[PDB]
Design a binder for this molecule. Structure first.
Ligand SMILES: Nc1nc2c(ncn2[C@@H]2O[C@H](COP(=O)(O)OP(=O)(O)CP(=O)(O)O)[C@@H](O)[C@H]2O)c(=O)[nH]1
Ligand SMILES: O=C1NCCc2c1[nH]c1c(-c3ccoc3)cccc21
Ligand SMILES: [Mg+2]
Length: 167
């Protein structure tokens, strides 16, 4: 069975855990329980292929930044999440991309830019500005909501397709 190693990264509070738990369990976590590092293994069918998704839900708290080196070496694709109402999380994206590129020693790492919390009216990052950043990196961009499930399956399945197409 083809196995895909996905890593969910981004600033503290953007909704990494809520996105992962929505994808796998189909419900929304309202509480904010900061992550150290959790992992999940889930079988899914993507484009008629039974896939094993190995999903690593990482820490956004900068206190755990030394753990990034290990997961960036082993991860095959990265879901780079910011929240549409948190401009600092959007600026933090570039730092995660640069770190991943350095650890892999490559500019062609499978990645998807995710603008989460798109259900909220408190937007601070225009969709066009995020589209422009994703175009500069050569990666897909999707807006998501862990509350409504908008874009959630597409974000994860697009990342699988980016890994599959790169190999
Ligand atoms: N309205 C809304 N709230 C969201 C969304 N995704 C997450 N949240 C909320 O944001 C808060 C943080 O979510 P969480 O999933 O813990 O974020 P995280 O990025 O994993 C936090 P850490 O980096 O510390 O592990 C929670 O209150 C959660 O309900 C979303 O799409 N919409
Ligand atoms: O190497 C592994 N052996 C088998 C079990 C396993 C391995 N990596 C995993 C990850 C993961 C994703 C990105 O990096 C690591 C997530 C969940 C389970 C994993
Ligand atoms: Mg978390």
């Amino acid at each position: 069975m083809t196995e895909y190693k996905l890593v969910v990264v981004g600033a503290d509070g953007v909704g990494k855990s809520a996105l992962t738990i929505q994808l796998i369990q189909n419900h929304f976590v309202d509480e904010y329980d900061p992550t150290i590092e959790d992992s999940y293994r889930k079988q899914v069918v993507i484009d008629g292929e039974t896939c094993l998704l190995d999903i690593l839900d990482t820490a956004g708290q900068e206190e755990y930044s030394a753990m990034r080196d290990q997961y960036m070496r082993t991860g095959e694709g990265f879901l780079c999440v910011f929240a549409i109402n948190n401009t600092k999380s959007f600026e933090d994206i570039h730092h995660y991309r640069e770190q991943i590129k350095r650890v892999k020693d490559s500019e062609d790492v499978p990645m998807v830019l995710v603008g989460n919390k798109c259900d909220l009216p408190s937007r601070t990052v225009d969709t066009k500005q995020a589209q422009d950043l994703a175009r500069s990196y050569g990666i897909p961009f999707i807006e998501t909501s862990a509350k409504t499930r908008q874009g959630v399956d597409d974000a994860f399945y697009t990342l699988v397709r980016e890994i599959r197409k790169h190999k």
